[PDB]
Amino acid sequence: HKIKGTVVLMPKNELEVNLNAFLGRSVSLQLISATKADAHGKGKVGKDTFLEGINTSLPTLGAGESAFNIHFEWDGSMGIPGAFYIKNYMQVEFFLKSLTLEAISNQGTIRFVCNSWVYNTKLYKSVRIFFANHTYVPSETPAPLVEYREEELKSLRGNGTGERKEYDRIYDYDVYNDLGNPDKSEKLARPVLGGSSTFPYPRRGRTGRGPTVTDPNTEKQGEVFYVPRDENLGHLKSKDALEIGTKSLSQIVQPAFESAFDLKSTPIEFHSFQDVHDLYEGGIKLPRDVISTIIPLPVIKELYRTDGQHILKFPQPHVVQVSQSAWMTDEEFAREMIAGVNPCVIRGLEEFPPKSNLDPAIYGDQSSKITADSLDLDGYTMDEALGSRRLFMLDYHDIFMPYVRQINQLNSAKTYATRTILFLREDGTLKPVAIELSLPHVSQVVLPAKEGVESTIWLLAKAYVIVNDSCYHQLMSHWLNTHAAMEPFVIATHRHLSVLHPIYKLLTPHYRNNMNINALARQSLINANGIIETTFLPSKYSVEMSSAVYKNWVFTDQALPADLIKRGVAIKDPSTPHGVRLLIEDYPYAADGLEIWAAIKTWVQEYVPLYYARDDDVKNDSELQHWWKEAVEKGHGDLKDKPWWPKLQTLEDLVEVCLIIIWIASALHAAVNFGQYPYGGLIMNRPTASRRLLPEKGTPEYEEMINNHEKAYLRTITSKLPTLISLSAIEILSTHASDEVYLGQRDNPHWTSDSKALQAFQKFGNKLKEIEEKLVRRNNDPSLQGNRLGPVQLPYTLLYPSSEEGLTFRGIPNSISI
Ligand SMILES: [Fe+3]
DSSP states (O other), rough: OOOEEEEEEEEEEGGOOOGHHHGSSSSEEEEEEEEOTTTTOOEEEEOOEOOOOOOOOSSOOOOTOOEEEEEOOOTTTTEEEEEEEEOOOOOOOOEEEEEEEEEETTTTEEEEEEEEEEEEEGOOOOOEEEEEOOOOOGGGGGGGGHHHHHHHHHHHOOOOOOOOOOOOOOOEEEEEESSSOOOTTTGGGOOOOOSSSSOOOOOOOOOOOOSSOTTTBBOOOOSOOOOGEEEEOOOOGGGOOOHHHHHHHIIIIIHHHHHHHTTTTTOOOOOOHHHHGGGGGOEEEEEEHHHHTTTTSSEEEEEEEEOSEEEBOOOOOOGGSOOOOOEEEEEEHHHHHHHSSSSSSSSSOOOSOOOOOOHHHHHOSSSSOOOGGGGGOTOOOOOHHHHOOOOEEEEEEEHHHHHHHHHHHTTTOOOEEEEEEEEEESSSSSEEEEEEEOOOOEEEEEEEOOOOHHHHHHHHHHHHHHHHHHHHIIIIOOOOOOOIIHHHHHHHHHHHSTTHHHHHHHHHGGGHHHHHHHHHHHHHSSTTTSHHHHHHHTTTGHHHHHHHTTTTGGGGGGGGHHHHHTSSEEOTTTTSTTSEEEEEEOOHHHHHHHHHHHHHHHHHHHHHGGGGSHHHHHOOHHHHHHHHHIIIIIIIIGGTOOTTSSOOOSSSHHHHHHHHHHHHIIIIHHHHHHTTHHHHHTTTTTTOOOOOOOOOOOSHHHHHHHHOOHHHHHBOOOHHHHHHHHHHHHHHHTBTTTOOOTTTTSOOSSSOOOHHHHHHHHHHHHHHHHHHHHHHHHOOOGGGGGHTTTTTOOOOOTTOSOOSSBBBSSSOSSSSSO
16 A cells, blocks of 8 residues: 655765755655566556655664655555665765665565665666665566666666766776876876787776877876766765875875975985884974875875974884884794785795796896705705705796896886795794895895895895885785786676676675775876886886786686695695695695685585576576676686686586685785785885895995995885885775775675575674684794794784774775775
């Protein structure tokens, strides 16, 4: 007869960085039948129904939320509602949370989970439609809803043309042709990444602003880089809009810092290690007009403590919280390769010497010059060490050698291509035993030393290694393997899986804020003269170097067990719980990771069978098949010919693909992202650039090395000004916003009506709490102190599932959210 409903929404003002106006004829809803169809087979549509009154007597409401009453006339000819249209006649958009229809019983309640911005009706080509929270593979869709389902998908795809506007909900692909700024200056031209065999690259979200005047292949600049509207996350609290901090850092803060150095208001260079420690003790003193430009900015103002006049004070990095000098030890240098910011590059060594795969015609003999007899392996012979699998390496030789010549031509950059040899001691810790520093076209081996000028040469050798590692970490482990690799799957999901689809509901929580942070990164982080180019060694070659590495990116090798085996740090072993035996038993990233991997695997294995009983059902799901086809052939289309792509013809394939996607977006990104300021907030520990080669004997640079090793170090690594910018950047990227959604959580508890899926999700969340307790016990186990805490006394918490807000060195978000 009449159906009572409650609409929950958020006015615009609540999510930026008058309630009676919603009443009257301002907002119309029309219910759509799931069971009665018109003559053309489409669900019957009801009459325009308007919000009747405010509902303050609702206790479930959250911050910024308002609830409205509504009553629908729905007679016996109309059936059961499964969807609704909404039309906003106001001039201002609002954020629609939910619609709930009440019935005589609690089972007869129908829930609509919306979470979508609704703009004025005149801006939309099609009326906004929303579905109830029932889950349906395509063949199970109630017949009267079939055409609505497909038409909404078509609306989300668009036609591949047009400039995208703020309120568009159109997902499509384009190449990375929007990073250069040639119309401003020819020196800001950058290669188009993607769509060629020279520069393969994952696609990003299409924006459609059109060509520059000087280069038809490059996309012109804009003040706002479009993302589909519901990707562009609002926040209740402006301090949680961390993603906009990078834009302010580049466009406002960096020019202000630069002015202070131009005017010689502060020393241009660090002169001692104390000058660096000062940054988080008494602070750095800057002119008042610089401070007054910085501290009124949202987000930016949270990065520093200030006296309001002259002081900016950075927070104390975790890595120096117990020992100011432990970072200099060989033990910590080695330990951070398995428990640091970038713990996933080290490889097992099964032959010696290590060899290069580079073309000898271009580079020279590239056989390693390290000799077995020069190494102190704690009394082991090389034969013994290899055979017991105690030798490991951090090999950046082949990755960097193709670019060293171009980098070293730049004015203030000089680098080597490095290899580091590591030995696994009988006590279970890694020992660095040699570093090889190579140039193309002298190339030196450096051995550990604790005394004399040689100990300084060794300290500098470690710095060149970490410059390699930092660049690889930021551009490859972090930017390429998580942010960039994931965006094509986000695009494909929205274009081809209905909101009704079980796999849409499984994956989309692991996409939150991903396209948004990436678009802001294209604008201010990885663009020409952006933050990365300004602060990291390779300058304008940074992003294209990640294209060279993408040539070898393999989707199925992103699975954690596969990665460990590929790198030779584990072996296949069915006698173990996880199917792999670690060659470095105490390996913190891998040992904790395997626990998280297994819990996600169990969740996916218990969810997929709820909707697919047999391999046939996977093959016959046309949305799933279109989704995976497009993700590979367009989204990662430069690699579409590779044989290792799963074909998605079996349940096992579907589980594997979903598990890998969830892994990349949650635990992998967390493990490489949230340690950036904790380890790298001391620039000497994680230098981002090197500016000169090793001094030659008999030069004043060499004499300086003998008499003042701290100054020799600081002249080698990142200069003070880029240090200040990069520390601010990585402080932002290392912070959890207070509205983060962590692994095992979801934003709405009624995301599906299927009680079976809800219970399996409850079990997943409980397992994560069990694992966190297990990991806590590992960090309290004295036998594992050597690798989990190290000389820096910093327990490895980066894979604890839960976290409070802030710069916490722990917590696994669902998604690539920062
Ligand atoms: Fe990130």
